[PDB]
PDB file of C-alpha atoms and ligand atoms in Angstrom:
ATOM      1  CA  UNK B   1       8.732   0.567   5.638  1.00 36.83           C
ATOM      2  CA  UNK B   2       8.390  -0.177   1.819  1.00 38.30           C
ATOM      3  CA  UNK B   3       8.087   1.456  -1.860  1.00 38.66           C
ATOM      4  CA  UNK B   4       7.278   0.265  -5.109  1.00 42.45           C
ATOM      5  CA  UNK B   5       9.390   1.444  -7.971  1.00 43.34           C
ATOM      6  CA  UNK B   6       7.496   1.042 -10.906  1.00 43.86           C
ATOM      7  CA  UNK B   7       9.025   3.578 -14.173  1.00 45.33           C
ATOM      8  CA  UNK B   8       9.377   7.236 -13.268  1.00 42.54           C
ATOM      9  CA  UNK B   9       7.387   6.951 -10.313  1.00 40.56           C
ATOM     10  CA  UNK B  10       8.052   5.657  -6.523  1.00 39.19           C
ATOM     11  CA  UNK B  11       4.779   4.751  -4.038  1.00 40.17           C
ATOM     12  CA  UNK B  12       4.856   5.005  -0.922  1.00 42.53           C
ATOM     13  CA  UNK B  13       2.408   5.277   1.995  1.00 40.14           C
ATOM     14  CA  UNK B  14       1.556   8.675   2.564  1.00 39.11           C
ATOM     15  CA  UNK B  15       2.244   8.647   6.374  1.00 39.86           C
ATOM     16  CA  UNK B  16       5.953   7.817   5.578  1.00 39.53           C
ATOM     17  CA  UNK B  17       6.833   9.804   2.845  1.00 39.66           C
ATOM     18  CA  UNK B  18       9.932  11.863   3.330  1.00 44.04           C
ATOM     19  CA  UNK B  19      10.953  15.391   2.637  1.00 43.69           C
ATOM     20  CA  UNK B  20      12.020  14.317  -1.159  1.00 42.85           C
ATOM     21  CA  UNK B  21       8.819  12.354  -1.789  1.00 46.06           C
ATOM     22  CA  UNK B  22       6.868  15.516  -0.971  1.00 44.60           C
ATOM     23  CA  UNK B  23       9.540  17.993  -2.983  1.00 45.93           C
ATOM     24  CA  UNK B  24       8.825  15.483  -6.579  1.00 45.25           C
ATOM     25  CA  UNK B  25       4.924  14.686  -5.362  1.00 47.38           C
ATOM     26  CA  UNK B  26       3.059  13.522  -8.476  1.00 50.41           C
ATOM     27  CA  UNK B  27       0.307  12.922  -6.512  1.00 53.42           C
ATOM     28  CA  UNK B  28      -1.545  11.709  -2.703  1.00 54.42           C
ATOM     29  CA  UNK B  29      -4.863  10.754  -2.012  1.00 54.79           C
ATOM     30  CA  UNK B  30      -4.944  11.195   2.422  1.00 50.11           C
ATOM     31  CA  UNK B  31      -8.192   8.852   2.115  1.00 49.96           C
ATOM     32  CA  UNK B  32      -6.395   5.914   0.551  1.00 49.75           C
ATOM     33  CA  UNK B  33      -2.929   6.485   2.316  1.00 54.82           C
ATOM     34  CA  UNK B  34      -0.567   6.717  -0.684  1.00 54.44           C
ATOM     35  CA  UNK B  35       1.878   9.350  -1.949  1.00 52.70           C
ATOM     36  CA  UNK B  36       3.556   8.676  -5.340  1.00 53.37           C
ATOM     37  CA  UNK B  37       7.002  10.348  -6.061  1.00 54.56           C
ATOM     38  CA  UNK B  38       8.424  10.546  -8.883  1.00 52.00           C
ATOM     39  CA  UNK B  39      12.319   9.430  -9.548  1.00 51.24           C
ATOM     40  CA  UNK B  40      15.227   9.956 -11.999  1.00 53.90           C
ATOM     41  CA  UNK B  41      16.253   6.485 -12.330  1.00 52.84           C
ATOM     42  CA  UNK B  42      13.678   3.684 -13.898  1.00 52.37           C
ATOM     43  CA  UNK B  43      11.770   1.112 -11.833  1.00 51.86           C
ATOM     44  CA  UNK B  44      11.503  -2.434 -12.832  1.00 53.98           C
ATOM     45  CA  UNK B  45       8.078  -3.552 -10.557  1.00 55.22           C
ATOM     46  CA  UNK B  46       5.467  -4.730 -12.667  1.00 58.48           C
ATOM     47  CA  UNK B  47       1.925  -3.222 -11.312  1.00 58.10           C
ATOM     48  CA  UNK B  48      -1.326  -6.422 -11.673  1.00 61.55           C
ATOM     49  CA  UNK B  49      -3.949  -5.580 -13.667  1.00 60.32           C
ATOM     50  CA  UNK B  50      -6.760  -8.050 -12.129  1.00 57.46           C
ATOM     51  CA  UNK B  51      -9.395  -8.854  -9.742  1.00 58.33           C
ATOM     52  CA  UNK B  52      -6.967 -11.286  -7.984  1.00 58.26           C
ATOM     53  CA  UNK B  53      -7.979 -12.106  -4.273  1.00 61.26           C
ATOM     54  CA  UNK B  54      -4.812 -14.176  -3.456  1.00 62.20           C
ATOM     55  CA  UNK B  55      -1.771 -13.515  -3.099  1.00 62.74           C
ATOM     56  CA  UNK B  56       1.532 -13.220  -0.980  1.00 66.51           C
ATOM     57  CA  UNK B  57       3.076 -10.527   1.224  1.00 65.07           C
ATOM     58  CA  UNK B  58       5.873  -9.577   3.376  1.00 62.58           C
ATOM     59  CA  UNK B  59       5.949  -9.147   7.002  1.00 60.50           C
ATOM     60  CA  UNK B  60       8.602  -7.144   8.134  1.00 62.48           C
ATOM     61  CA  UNK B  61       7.723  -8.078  12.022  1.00 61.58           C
ATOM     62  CA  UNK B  62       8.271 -11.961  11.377  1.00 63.70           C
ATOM     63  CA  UNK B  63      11.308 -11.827   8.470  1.00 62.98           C
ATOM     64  CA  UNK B  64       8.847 -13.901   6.521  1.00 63.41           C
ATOM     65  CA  UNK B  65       6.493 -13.904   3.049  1.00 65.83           C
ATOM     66  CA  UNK B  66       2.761 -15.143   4.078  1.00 66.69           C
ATOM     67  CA  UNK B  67      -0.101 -16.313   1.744  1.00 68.24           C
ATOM     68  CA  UNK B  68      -3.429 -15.200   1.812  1.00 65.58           C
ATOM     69  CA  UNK B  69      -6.869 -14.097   0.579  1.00 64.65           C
ATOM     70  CA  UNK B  70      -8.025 -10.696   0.803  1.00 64.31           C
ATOM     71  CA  UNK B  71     -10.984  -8.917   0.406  1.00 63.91           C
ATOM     72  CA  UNK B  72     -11.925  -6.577  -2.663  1.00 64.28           C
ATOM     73  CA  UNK B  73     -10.834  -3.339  -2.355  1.00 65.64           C
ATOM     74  CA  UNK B  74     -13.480  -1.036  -0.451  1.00 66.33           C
ATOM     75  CA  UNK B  75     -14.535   1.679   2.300  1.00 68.07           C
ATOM     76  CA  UNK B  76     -13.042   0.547   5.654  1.00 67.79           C
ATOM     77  CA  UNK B  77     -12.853   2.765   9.299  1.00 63.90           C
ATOM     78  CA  UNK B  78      -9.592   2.948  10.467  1.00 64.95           C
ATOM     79  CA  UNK B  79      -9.020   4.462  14.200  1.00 65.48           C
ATOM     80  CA  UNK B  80      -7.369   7.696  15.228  1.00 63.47           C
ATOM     81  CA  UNK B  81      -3.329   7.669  14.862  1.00 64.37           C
ATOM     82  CA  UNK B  82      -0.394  10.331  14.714  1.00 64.69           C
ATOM     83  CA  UNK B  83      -1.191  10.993  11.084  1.00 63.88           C
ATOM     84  CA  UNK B  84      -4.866  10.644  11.032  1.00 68.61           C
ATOM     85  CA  UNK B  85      -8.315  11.304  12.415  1.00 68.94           C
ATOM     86  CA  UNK B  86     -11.003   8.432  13.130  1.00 66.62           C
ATOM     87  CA  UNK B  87     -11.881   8.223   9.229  1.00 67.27           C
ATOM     88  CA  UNK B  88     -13.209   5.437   6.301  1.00 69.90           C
ATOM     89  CA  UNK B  89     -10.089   4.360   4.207  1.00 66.43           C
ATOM     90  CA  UNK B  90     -10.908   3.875   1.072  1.00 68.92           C
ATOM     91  CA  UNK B  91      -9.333   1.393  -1.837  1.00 69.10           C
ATOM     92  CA  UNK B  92      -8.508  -0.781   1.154  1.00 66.03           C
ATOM     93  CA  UNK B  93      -8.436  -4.654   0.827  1.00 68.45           C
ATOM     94  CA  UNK B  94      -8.578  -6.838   4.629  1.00 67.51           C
ATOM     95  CA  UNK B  95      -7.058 -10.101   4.923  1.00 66.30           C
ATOM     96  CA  UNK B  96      -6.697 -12.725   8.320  1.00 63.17           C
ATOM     97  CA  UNK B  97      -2.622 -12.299   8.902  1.00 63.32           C
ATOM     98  CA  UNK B  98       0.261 -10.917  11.192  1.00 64.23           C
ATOM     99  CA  UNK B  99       0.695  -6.999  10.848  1.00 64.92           C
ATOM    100  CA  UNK B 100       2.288  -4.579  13.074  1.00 63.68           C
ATOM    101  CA  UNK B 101       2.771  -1.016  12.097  1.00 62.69           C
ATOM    102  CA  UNK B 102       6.200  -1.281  11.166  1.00 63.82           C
ATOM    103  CA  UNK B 103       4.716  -3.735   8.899  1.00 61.05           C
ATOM    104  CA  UNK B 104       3.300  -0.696   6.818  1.00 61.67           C
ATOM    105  CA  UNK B 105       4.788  -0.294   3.201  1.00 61.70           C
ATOM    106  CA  UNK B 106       5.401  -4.640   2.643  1.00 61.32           C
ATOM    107  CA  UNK B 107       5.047  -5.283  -0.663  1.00 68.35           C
ATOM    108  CA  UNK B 108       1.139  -7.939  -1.775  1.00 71.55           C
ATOM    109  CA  UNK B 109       1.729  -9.150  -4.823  1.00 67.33           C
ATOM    110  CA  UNK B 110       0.091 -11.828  -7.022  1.00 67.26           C
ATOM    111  CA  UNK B 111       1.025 -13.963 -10.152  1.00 68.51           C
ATOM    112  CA  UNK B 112      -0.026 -11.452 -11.913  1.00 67.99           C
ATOM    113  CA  UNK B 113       2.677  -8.252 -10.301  1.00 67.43           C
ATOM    114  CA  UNK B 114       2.274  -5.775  -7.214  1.00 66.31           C
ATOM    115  CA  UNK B 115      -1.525  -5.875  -5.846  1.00 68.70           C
ATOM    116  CA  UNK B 116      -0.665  -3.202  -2.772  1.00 67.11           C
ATOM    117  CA  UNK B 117       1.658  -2.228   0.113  1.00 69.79           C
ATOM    118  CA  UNK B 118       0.700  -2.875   4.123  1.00 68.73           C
ATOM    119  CA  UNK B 119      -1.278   0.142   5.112  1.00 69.06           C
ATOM    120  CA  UNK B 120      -3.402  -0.591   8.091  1.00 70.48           C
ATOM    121  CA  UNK B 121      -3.936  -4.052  11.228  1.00 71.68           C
ATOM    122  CA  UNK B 122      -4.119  -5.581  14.481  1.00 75.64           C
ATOM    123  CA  UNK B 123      -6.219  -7.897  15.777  1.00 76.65           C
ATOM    124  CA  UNK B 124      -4.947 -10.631  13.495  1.00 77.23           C
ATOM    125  CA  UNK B 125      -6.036  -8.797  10.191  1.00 76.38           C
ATOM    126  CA  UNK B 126      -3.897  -6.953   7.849  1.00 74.65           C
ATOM    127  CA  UNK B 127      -5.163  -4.275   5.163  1.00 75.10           C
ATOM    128  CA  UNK B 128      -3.460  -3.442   1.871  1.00 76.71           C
ATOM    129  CA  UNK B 129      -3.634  -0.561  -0.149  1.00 74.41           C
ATOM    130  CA  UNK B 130      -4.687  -1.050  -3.612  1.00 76.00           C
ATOM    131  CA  UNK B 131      -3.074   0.376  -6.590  1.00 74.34           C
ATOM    132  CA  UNK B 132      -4.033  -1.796  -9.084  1.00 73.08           C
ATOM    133  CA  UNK B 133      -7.087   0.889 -10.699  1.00 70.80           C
ATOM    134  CA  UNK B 134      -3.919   3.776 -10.758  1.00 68.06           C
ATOM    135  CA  UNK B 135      -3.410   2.653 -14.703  1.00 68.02           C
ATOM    136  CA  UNK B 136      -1.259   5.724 -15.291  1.00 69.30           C
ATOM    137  CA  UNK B 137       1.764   4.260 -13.112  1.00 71.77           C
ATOM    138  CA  UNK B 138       2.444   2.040 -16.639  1.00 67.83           C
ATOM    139  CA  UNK B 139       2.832   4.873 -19.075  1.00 67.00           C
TER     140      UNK B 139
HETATM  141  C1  LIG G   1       0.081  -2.084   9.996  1.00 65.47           C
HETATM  142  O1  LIG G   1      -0.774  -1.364  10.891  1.00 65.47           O
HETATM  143  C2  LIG G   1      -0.989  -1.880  12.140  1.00 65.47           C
HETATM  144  C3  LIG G   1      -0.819  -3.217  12.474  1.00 65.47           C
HETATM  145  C4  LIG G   1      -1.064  -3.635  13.775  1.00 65.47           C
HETATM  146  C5  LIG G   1      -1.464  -2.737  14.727  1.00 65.47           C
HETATM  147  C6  LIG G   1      -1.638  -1.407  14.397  1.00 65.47           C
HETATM  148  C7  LIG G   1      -1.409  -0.955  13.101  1.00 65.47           C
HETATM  149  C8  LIG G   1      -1.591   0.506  12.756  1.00 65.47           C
HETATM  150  C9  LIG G   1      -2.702   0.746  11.750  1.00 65.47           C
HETATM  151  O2  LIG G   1      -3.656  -0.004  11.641  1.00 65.47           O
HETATM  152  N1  LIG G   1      -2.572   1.851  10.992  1.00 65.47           N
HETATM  153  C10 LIG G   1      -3.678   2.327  10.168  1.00 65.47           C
HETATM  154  C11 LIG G   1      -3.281   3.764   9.836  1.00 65.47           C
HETATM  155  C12 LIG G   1      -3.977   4.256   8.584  1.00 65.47           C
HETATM  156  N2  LIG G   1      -3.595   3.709   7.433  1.00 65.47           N
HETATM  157  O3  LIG G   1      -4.858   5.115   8.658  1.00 65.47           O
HETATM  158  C13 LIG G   1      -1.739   3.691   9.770  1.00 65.47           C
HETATM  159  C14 LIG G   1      -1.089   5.008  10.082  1.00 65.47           C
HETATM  160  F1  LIG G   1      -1.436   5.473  11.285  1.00 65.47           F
HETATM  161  F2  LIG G   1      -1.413   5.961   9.193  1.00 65.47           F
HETATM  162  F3  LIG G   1       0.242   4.920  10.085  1.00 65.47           F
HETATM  163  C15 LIG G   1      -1.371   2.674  10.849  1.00 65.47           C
HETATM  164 ZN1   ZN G   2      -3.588 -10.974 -10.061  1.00 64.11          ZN
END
């Protein structure tokens, strides 16, 4: 589990949005697994605006903040689940760490602010979504 809260807006990954999120959608893209919510109070996350490929995230299954490098963000399959059918992921950014799918939703984030949020692993590789190209979330 995990959201960023960045001004009027709260995103999450689409697969575990709640009944709210979907009641004050702003908007969800199924490909790239986010939903964004909006919210009444203001959020203080700062979004990166860069072509970083480093960074830090946390790991809900080990209690513990990891550094790593991670791949630009691109087209990716992802297998069949409860949510979704065999499909290419898109705006999706791999990286050689720990992820289980409770994982989904920790926060990557760079010097620079938020990079992405746990979206996909196994097999000792964890993918991010991006959200660094949705500009909007600033104003
Ligand atoms: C953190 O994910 C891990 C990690 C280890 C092992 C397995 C997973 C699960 C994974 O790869 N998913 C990809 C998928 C997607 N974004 O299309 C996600 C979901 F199904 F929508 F919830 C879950
Ligand atoms: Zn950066």
């Amino acid at each position: 589990s995990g959201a960023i809260y960045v001004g009027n807006y709260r995103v999450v990954n689409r697969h575990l949005a709640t009944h709210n999120d979907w009641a004050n959608l702003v908007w969800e893209d199924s490909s790239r697994d986010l939903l964004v919510s909006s919210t009444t109070a203001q959020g203080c996350d700062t979004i990166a605006r860069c072509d970083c490929q480093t960074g830090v995230y946390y790991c809900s299954s080990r209690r513990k903040h990891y550094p790593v490098s991670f791949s630009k963000p691109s087209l990716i399959f992802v297998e069949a689940s409860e949510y979704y059918p065999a499909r290419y992921q898109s705006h999706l950014m791999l990286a050689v760490g720990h992820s289980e799918p409770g994982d989904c939703g920790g926060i990557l984030r760079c010097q620079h602010g938020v990079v992405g949020i746990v979206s996909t692993g196994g097999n000792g590789l964890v993918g991010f979504a991006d959200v660094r190209d949705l500009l909007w979330l600033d104003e």
